[PDB]
Amino acid sequence: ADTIVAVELDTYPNTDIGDPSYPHIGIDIKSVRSKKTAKWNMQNGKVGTAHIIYNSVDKRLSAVVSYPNADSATVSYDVDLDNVLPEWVRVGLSASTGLYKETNTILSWSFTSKLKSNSTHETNALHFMFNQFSKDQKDLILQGDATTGTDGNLELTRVSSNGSPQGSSVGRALFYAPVHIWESSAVVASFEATFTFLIKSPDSHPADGIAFFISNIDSSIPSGSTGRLLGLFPDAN
Amino acid sequence: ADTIVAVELDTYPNTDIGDPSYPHIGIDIKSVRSKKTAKWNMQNGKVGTAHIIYNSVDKRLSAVVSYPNADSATVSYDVDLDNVLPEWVRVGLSASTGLYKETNTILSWSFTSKLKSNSTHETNALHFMFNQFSKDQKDLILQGDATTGTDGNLELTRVSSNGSPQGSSVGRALFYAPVHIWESSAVVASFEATFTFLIKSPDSHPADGIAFFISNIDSSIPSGSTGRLLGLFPDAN
Amino acid sequence: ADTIVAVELDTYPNTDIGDPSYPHIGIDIKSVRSKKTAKWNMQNGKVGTAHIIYNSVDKRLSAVVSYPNADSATVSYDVDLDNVLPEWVRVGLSASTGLYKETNTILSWSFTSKLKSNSTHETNALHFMFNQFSKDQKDLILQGDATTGTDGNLELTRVSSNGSPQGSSVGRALFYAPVHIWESSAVVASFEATFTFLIKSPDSHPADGIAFFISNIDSSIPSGSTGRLLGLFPDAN
Amino acid sequence: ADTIVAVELDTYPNTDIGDPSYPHIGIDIKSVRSKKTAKWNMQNGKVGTAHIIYNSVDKRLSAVVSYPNADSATVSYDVDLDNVLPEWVRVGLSASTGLYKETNTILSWSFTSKLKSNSTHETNALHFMFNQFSKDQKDLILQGDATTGTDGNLELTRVSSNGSPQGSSVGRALFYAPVHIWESSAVVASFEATFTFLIKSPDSHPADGIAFFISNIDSSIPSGSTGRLLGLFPDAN
Ligand SMILES: CO[C@H]1O[C@H](CO)[C@@H](O)[C@H](O[C@H]2O[C@H](CO)[C@@H](O)[C@H](O)[C@@H]2O)[C@@H]1O
Numbered sequence: 001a002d003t004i005v006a007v008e009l010d011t012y013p014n015t016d017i018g019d020p021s022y023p024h025i026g027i028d029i030k031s032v033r034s035k036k037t038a039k040w041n042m043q044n045g046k047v048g049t050a051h052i053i054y055n056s057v058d059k060r061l062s063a064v065v066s067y068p069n070a071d072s073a074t075v076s077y078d079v080d081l082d083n084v085l086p087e088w089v090r091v092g093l094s095a096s097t098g099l100y101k102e103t104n105t106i107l108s109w110s111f112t113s114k115l116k117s118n119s120t121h122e123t124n125a126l127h128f129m130f131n132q133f134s135k136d137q138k139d140l141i142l143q144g145d146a147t148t149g150t151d152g153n154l155e156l157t158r159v160s161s162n163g164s165p166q167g168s169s170v171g172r173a174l175f176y177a178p179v180h181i182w183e184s185s186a187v188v189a190s191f192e193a194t195f196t197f198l199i200k201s202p203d204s205h206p207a208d209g210i211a212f213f214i215s216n217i218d219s220s221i222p223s224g225s226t227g228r229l230l231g232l233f234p235d236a237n
Numbered sequence: 238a239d240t241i242v243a244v245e246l247d248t249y250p251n252t253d254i255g256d257p258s259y260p261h262i263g264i265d266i267k268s269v270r271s272k273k274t275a276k277w278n279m280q281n282g283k284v285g286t287a288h289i290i291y292n293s294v295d296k297r298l299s300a301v302v303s304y305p306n307a308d309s310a311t312v313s314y315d316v317d318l319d320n321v322l323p324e325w326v327r328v329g330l331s332a333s334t335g336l337y338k339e340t341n342t343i344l345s346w347s348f349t350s351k352l353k354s355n356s357t358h359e360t361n362a363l364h365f366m367f368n369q370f371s372k373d374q375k376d377l378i379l380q381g382d383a384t385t386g387t388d389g390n391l392e393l394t395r396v397s398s399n400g401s402p403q404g405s406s407v408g409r410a411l412f413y414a415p416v417h418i419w420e421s422s423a424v425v426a427s428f429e430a431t432f433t434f435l436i437k438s439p440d441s442h443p444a445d446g447i448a449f450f451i452s453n454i455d456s457s458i459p460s461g462s463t464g465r466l467l468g469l470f471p472d473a474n
Numbered sequence: 475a476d477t478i479v480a481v482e483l484d485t486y487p488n489t490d491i492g493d494p495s496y497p498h499i500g501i502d503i504k505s506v507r508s509k510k511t512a513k514w515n516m517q518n519g520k521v522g523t524a525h526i527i528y529n530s531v532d533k534r535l536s537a538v539v540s541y542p543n544a545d546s547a548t549v550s551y552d553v554d555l556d557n558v559l560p561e562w563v564r565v566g567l568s569a570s571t572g573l574y575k576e577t578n579t580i581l582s583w584s585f586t587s588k589l590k591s592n593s594t595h596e597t598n599a600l601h602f603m604f605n606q607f608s609k610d611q612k613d614l615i616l617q618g619d620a621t622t623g624t625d626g627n628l629e630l631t632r633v634s635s636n637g638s639p640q641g642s643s644v645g646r647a648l649f650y651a652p653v654h655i656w657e658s659s660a661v662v663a664s665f666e667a668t669f670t671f672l673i674k675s676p677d678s679h680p681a682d683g684i685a686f687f688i689s690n691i692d693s694s695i696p697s698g699s700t701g702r703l704l705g706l707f708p709d710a711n
Numbered sequence: 712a713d714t715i716v717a718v719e720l721d722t723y724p725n726t727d728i729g730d731p732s733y734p735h736i737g738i739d740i741k742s743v744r745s746k747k748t749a750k751w752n753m754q755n756g757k758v759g760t761a762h763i764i765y766n767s768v769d770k771r772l773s774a775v776v777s778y779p780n781a782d783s784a785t786v787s788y789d790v791d792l793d794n795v796l797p798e799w800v801r802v803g804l805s806a807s808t809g810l811y812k813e814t815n816t817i818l819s820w821s822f823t824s825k826l827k828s829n830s831t832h833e834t835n836a837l838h839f840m841f842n843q844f845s846k847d848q849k850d851l852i853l854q855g856d857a858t859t860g861t862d863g864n865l866e867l868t869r870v871s872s873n874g875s876p877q878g879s880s881v882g883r884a885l886f887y888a889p890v891h892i893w894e895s896s897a898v899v900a901s902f903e904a905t906f907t908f909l910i911k912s913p914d915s916h917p918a919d920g921i922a923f924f925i926s927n928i929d930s931s932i933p934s935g936s937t938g939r940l941l942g943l944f945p946d947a948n
């Protein structure tokens with residue numbers, strides 16, 4: 001039972017489980033039923049960007065998704081991460097396919113985290129920037145169908161030799177080091193994440209989406225968590 | 238007529254104009270009557286730290302002030318700086334003495350700004366960190382009784398050779414370069430500021446406070462703006 | 475008179491003054507006659523990158539120039555900047571043309587400078603990054619024919635609306651803030667600068683070149699320093 | 712067998728293995744017999760600071776060690792780390808004792824690493840800054856006698872509750888994630904490291920010294936590498 005917090009980019013509306021009737025981006029606290037969502041004007045074949053920020057002052061997690069020359073989509077939710085997550089965690093990217101599929105490529109990824117402790121008013125921090133992925137990336141923990149090196153890109157779900165996506169796939173990419181996401185004595189604590197992606201699809205119904213997540217350290221892909229579950233949750237409850 | 242946005246660290250309660258009956262920190266939009274305030278347990282003779290954050294997404298300006306091993310004071314206010322300030326501004330510190338005084342020493346001052354453009358999705362940034370002040374700081378625009386070099390600190394208001402604070406003093410320090418605080422075509426835009434200070438006062442009634450501020454490029458201390466006016470506003474209206 | 479240090483991307487060989495018989499990159503210490511040079515494979519029509527570094531430990535100024543998938547040119551010169559420059563400078567870019575011309579487009583520019591003090595061991599620093607140039611770039615001091623905003627790019631030399639480069643042109647762009655490039659009490663001083671350029675010429679002999687420079691605060695384009703002088707030097711001695 | 716590059720801060724002169732007759736700082740390349748050294752005015756009881764820098768242009772590894780208001784010791788060596796280390800490494804701190812001892816307290820540690828690629832021309836970075844060490848630092852791998860939490864410092868070697876150091880102690884602290892220290896496609900690669908320490912001793916001859924090292928991923932304290940070997944080398948050959 002992993003504790004999970006995520007920002008999803010749902011490309012397929014699973015109206016059974018509370019997903020609205022269109023692609024959208026949402027926020028997930030311990031469940032695949034997003035506490036808050038927002039219509040996202042998904043664009044197939046185009047490189048997009050997702051920015052996610054959070055800070056220990058407003059105690060608010062927000063995220064923006066956009067494509068060059070187009071309206072951006074925003075989603076925010078008030079959440080006190082101190083009570084939802086353990087102090088040490090790991091951060092990652094995650095995508096899945098089901099009966100429907102799409103490329104779940106990641107062109108770049110950046111993350112910064114700062115803990116400005118009470119005791120000294122001296123910062124603790126971590127930052128990593130990936131604009132190119134080496135075929136043997138030793139600082140990423142690839143889980144599932146996640147591979148690196150193809151064009152300097154991170155391909156989260158299985159894509160064949162033809163450049164075409166495979167159905168029923170799941171992948172996850174985690175930074176090797178555990179991040180100190182919060183501390184009892186911190187004045188301010190914050191994080192900022194960004195990643196550009198390319199969700200291409202040869203059909204008319206792409207699924208299932210990508211998602212930036214923060215989990216307990218030893219998290220692993222929940223068995224059979226493909227499709228609508230986006231490699232994060234064991235059940236749609 | 239300057240357009241001013243500031244976060245004051247009001248040490249003296251001027252109940253004439255709206256101040257609450259205790260030291261407080263507050264948010265000022267074009268006026269000295271804080272749109273929002275919060276109780277601050279002002280500690281005389283001790284270093285404090287102040288953090289001001291803001292982001293184009295929640296369009297919210299928060300501020301946290303604190304002392305090592307004590308409670309922090311926080312205040313936030315929802316404000317679209319896009320409709321209050323011009324795109325090009327300058328940032329600075331300001332302080333004032335009136336019938337009552339205090340040293341308005343500034344031990345360090347850091348600032349970051351980023352603009353994540355839409356047309357390109359690439360960042361534009363600025364960052365400066367002063368952990369020491371030379372006696373001839375050429376990147377600071379000193380105004381009023383503001384001086385540098387004394388011990389490596391920035392003395393906003395007049396302090397004699399005796400080290401004692403002087404009444405009816407005003408001082409401001411502005412970073413030489415104009416900051417591009419916002420843009421119409423930007424996806425995300427954020428700034429963060431931090432400074433440590435030392436408000437000492439021989440007596441029992443210190444006044445009048447420090448304030449980080451953003452203003453129009455050619456901002457100049459309003460005439461006779463000492464005391465309650467904290468070198469930022471001409472009138473108490 | 476001005477005190478100048480520069481890294482030229484000399485595209486036109488001026489044998490009369492010392493320029494070796496081919497396009498090269500060099501290190502100018504107070505003279506257009508480079509103290510050290512290196513053959514450069516100037517590619518007309520391609521975006522290139524230049525990286526300049528220097529630290530107070532090695533007391534060496536190096537530079538690298540490269541194009542995606544190609545041999546990179548390197549140049550280095552041991553120089554003690556303490557005895558060559560004043561402690562406060564200004565940094566900028568400079569191009570020029572003479573009888574022959576080329577576009578001197580600047581797609582991006584970034585710069586970082588740090589000062590780790592002796593008296594305290596706490597760093598002071600400045601960082602600015604430009605990935606887009608607004609039509610009213612208020613934090614750059616434009617000199618000569620230099621214009622911002624055309625396509626988001628910086629044009630150091632005159633360029634027609636057609637896109638054709640023009641002869642006898644001189645331009646510079648300095649960052650607004652004076653940089654504290656070195657201090658006696660500094661344990662370690664260092665600066666890093668990067669910038670991507672596009673030198674497009676319609677003819678066969680491009681000229682005259684781009685330059686990264688550190689100068690005294692009030693530097694300005696010398697009289698008649700077009701062509702082989704690259705907006706930097708008054709004479710050729 | 713380990714591949715190790717280090718920068719010792721030899722506090723005990725082991726005249727039998729190549730150590731000069733006095734406290735020094737050295738550059739070790741696959742051996743405890745420093746390729747290059749320089750006298751160090753080791754001050755017992757004061758907080759020092761060490762700064763290591765390297766870049767793939769000069770291919771020169773430099774180190775500076777200083778105390779507040781005291782001369783700095785400098786040492787540099789021309790080494791092409793591409794032919795000495797594997798592309799993926801781990802960086803960490805090490806310290807040791809033997810017949811004589813000292814406390815090897817690290818009050819802060821910082822490290823930055825950049826890779827400006829040739830194929831792409833966009834950087835890959837990693838940065839971590841420790842100003843405080845929690846009692847369960849999950850992003851550091853502790854080996855031997857290294858403990859976190861005591862005061863907020865990292866004791867590389869055994870220290871009793873009294874505060875007195877102990878003989879024949881050994882310990883390291885590596886950063887959890889592997890660093891991509893270099894790549895064949897890299898135009899520029901560089902790293903900068905900084906850490907402050909406090910070497911206190913109750914006697915007249917402290918030993919054996921602290922060291923910043925870069926090793927292959929799976930490195931571990933070699934058997935018997937206490938004393939003169941500083942937890943890095945199996946023998947003294
Ligand atoms: C036609 O596909 C829809 O109906 C099918 C039969 O009822 C479902 O199996 C299918 O769900 C699966 O695919 C989606 C889209 O890829 C995925 O989100 C879901 O978790 C299942 O794997 C879909 O509803």
Ligand SMILES: CO[C@H]1O[C@H](CO)[C@@H](O)[C@H](O[C@H]2O[C@H](CO)[C@@H](O)[C@H](O)[C@@H]2O)[C@@H]1O
Binds near residue numbers: 463
């Ligand atoms: C005891 O001082 C208070 O009462 C005085 C008489 O009513 C006021 O003049 C005085 O105001 C002045 O000092 C304060 C504190 O420094 C300052 O805020 C104000 O602008 C005046 O200079 C204060 O209210």
Ligand SMILES: CO[C@H]1O[C@H](CO)[C@@H](O)[C@H](O[C@H]2O[C@H](CO)[C@@H](O)[C@H](O)[C@@H]2O)[C@@H]1O
Binds near residue numbers: 486681700701702
């Ligand atoms: C053919 O041009 C060469 O010879 C001419 C006659 O001697 C010179 O005028 C000319 O110099 C000018 O143009 C170059 C090329 O742009 C420039 O580097 C120089 O500063 C003059 O403007 C060149 O030597």
Ligand SMILES: CO[C@H]1O[C@H](CO)[C@@H](O)[C@H](O[C@H]2O[C@H](CO)[C@@H](O)[C@H](O)[C@@H]2O)[C@@H]1O
Binds near residue numbers: 808810938
């Ligand atoms: C007085 O100790 C010196 O002489 C002893 C007898 O010859 C040695 O055992 C001793 O070596 C040990 O201590 C040093 C100092 O801590 C250490 O560097 C060495 O590896 C041994 O542990 C020292 O030479």
Ligand SMILES: [Ca+2]
Binds near residue numbers: 011012014019208
């Ligand atoms: Ca879905």
Ligand SMILES: [Ca+2]
Binds near residue numbers: 248250251445465
């Ligand atoms: Ca007041």
Ligand SMILES: [Ca+2]
Binds near residue numbers: 488682683702
């Ligand atoms: Ca020339």
Ligand SMILES: [Ca+2]
Binds near residue numbers: 721722723725730919
């Ligand atoms: Ca020794």
Ligand SMILES: [Mn+2]
Binds near residue numbers: 026
């Ligand atoms: Mn959903």
Ligand SMILES: [Mn+2]
Binds near residue numbers: 245247263269
């Ligand atoms: Mn007030």
Ligand SMILES: [Mn+2]
Binds near residue numbers: 493
């Ligand atoms: Mn030349």
Ligand SMILES: [Mn+2]
Binds near residue numbers: 729744
């Ligand atoms: Mn030695």
